[model samples]
Target: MISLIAALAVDRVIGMENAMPWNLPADLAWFKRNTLNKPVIMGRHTWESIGRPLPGRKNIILSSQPGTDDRVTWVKSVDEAIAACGDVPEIMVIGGGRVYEQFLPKAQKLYLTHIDAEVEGDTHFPDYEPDDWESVFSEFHDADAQNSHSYCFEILERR
Candidate 1:
C-alpha cells in the first residue's frame, strides 16, 4: 500500500524552480509529524536536497542513475519502489511532481496540506479527480504573521 504526503497551494502549485513556493512552518510540522515512522520514497532531486537519509524512517530513492548508500535504498523504477515497500501497511511517497504523478494512482491514502493563496510556480501537483477520494479527516489552521495564509489539513482515502 502507498500513501502520499505533500503541501500545495490552492492552485495546485507545488514548487517554484525546484523548491516550494511557500514556507509554512505549521505545515512543515504537520508533515514531519505525519511522515514519522513511515517509509518515505522520493525522487533524486528531492533526495539530493535532503543530502541524507531521513532519521527514524526507511528512506527509498527512485532514480534512473545508480547510487549506493547504506542509509538509503535505491530503486530504478516505480515498480521497484513498490516492491521495496513490501508488507508495510502503507508507505509514504514524498514530493517532486513527476514522482507524485506516477505513484498517486496506486496510493490508498493522501495526507495533504492546502494553502489558501495561489501564486505562480514552476512546478505543480499531480492531477486527480476529487470524486475519486473521500475526506476521512480534516482540520483548519489560520495563518499568522509568519505563515501568511490559511491552510487546511486533510486525510483522504480512495473511494
Candidate 2:
C-alpha cells in the first residue's frame, strides 16, 4: 500500500508558488530517515523542485509527459506505481498538492507534519476530515531556532 510524508503549515497551506514556506531541518531529516531506500513517488514539478534524486532512495516521478532517468521511474497512473512496487510493503507518495489528492484514497498510512501557525498562501492541502481517519499516533513538537514552527507528527489510517 502507498504512504504519504508531507510538511504542512496551519490552515493546510502546503505550498507558496511550488515551494514550502517554512524551514524545518528536523522535519527534512525525519523525512529522509523514514523514506530512504524506498521508492518515493511524486509529480513532475516536485521532482524538478528537488533537482536531483534523493540519496538512498528510488525516485519515481508520476507524469503524463514522457522523460526520465536511471533513479527516476516514470509512471502514468497510481496503479502503475503500485504495480512497480511489487511486494514491497512501503512506497512513499511525496508531493505537491495535486499528487497527494490523486494518491490519498489509495494510501494506507499518512505521515503528516502539521504546523501550528497559519500564513497566507496560494496552495492548500486537500481536506480530509480527521473523523474519517483513525489517528493512531501523534507527537507534538515546539518551535525551535531552526524550524521556527511548532508542529505535530501525525500517523493516521482510514477507518
Candidate 3:
C-alpha cells in the first residue's frame, strides 16, 4: 500500500523554503519509527531538503540522474518507483511538492500532523475536501509551556 506522510498548517502550507517551520521532537521520532525500513519515495527537491537519505530506510529518489548516494535508488517516475517498491509493507510517499501530487491519488492512507499555526510558505498540502477523505483516526495535542503550538495527528483514508 502507498502512504503519504507530512505535517501541515491551518492554511495547508507544508513549507515556505523547503524546511518545516517548527520542531516537534515527538513527531520526528514517530515518523522515523514508522517509516524506517520502508520503501520511501521522494523527489529530488525533497531529497535535497533532507540533506541526505535518511538512514535505516530505503530511499527511492525520483530523479533523472543517479548520484553517488547508492543508498538512494533513483527512479524516473512515480509509477516506476511504485513498481520498484514491490512487496514492501508500505510504500511511503515522502515529499517536496511534485512528489506529493503524484502519489496522493494512489495512496490508501495518509498520516498527517496538523500544526495549529500558519507561516509564509510557497508550498502547501493538497487541498483535501472532507468529502474526499474519511478520518479513520485522530488525536489532538496541546502545546507545552516550552512550545506555543498545539497540534493533531490524523489518519485518513480516501472515501
Candidate 4:
C-alpha cells in the first residue's frame, strides 16, 4: 500500500520559501505517530530541506539530481521507490508538490491536515477529487500558543 501524508493551508499551500509557513507541533506529532517505522518517499528538495534521513524509518528520495547520500535510498521514479521497499505493507509519500502529484493517483490512503488560514506560499498540494476518497477519520484541533493554526486531521482511504 502507498499513502500520502501532508499538511496544507486553506489556500492549499504546503511550502513558503522552501519551508513550512506555520509551526504546528500537534500536526508534527500526528505525522510522526503515523509514519514511525514506515518507509517514506520524498523529492530531492524536500530531502535537502529535511537535512537528514528521518530516524526510525527508511528514507527514500525521488530525484533526477546526481548525488548520493548514505542515509537514503535514492530512486528516479515512484515505481522504483515502491520496489525499493520490498514487501513493506505501506509506504508514505511525504512531499513538496510534484512528488505528491506523481503518487496521488496510486496512493491508497491520505493523511492530511487542513489548516484554517490561507498562507502565502510558492508550493501547493496537488488538486485531488474528493469523491475518489472516503473519509475514515477526522479530528479537529483548536489553535493554542504552540500551534498557530486551527486545523483538522483527516484520514482518507480510496473508495
Best by TM-score: 4
Better of 2 and 3 by lDDT: 3
lDDT of each: 0.87, 0.83, 0.84, 0.91
Candidate 2 per-residue lDDT over residues 28-105, each given as its tens digit: 988988898888988888888789988887778888878667667888887887787667878898987888998888
Q: lDDT value for candidate 3?
A: 0.84
lDDT at position 21, candidate 3: 76
* Count of clashes in candidate 4: 0
Could you give candidate 1's per-residue lDDT for residues 75-110 as a string of tens digits?
A: 999989888877888799997888999988888999
Candidate 3's displacement at residue 4, Å, is 0.3
User: Which has the better lDDT: candidate 3, or candidate 4?
Assistant: 4
- Alpha-carbon runs more than 4 Å astray in model 3: 145-147
With candidate 4 superimposed using the best TM-score fit, by how many Å does residue 80's alpha carbon deviate from the native?
Answer: 0.9
Could you give candidate 4's per-residue lDDT for residues 1-159 as a string of tens digits? 999999999778999888886788999999999999999999999988888889999999998765587778988877888999889889999998999999999999999999998889999999999899999999998999999779999999999
The model with the greater TM-score, 2 or 4, is: 4
Q: lDDT winner among the candidates?
A: 4
List the candidates ranked by lDDT, beginning with the highest: 4, 1, 3, 2
Model 3 worst lDDT window (10 residues): 63-72
Candidate 2: segments with Cα more than 4 A from true spot: none
TM-score of each: 0.92, 0.92, 0.92, 0.96
Q: Which parts of model 1 have CA positions greater than 4 angstroms off?
A: none
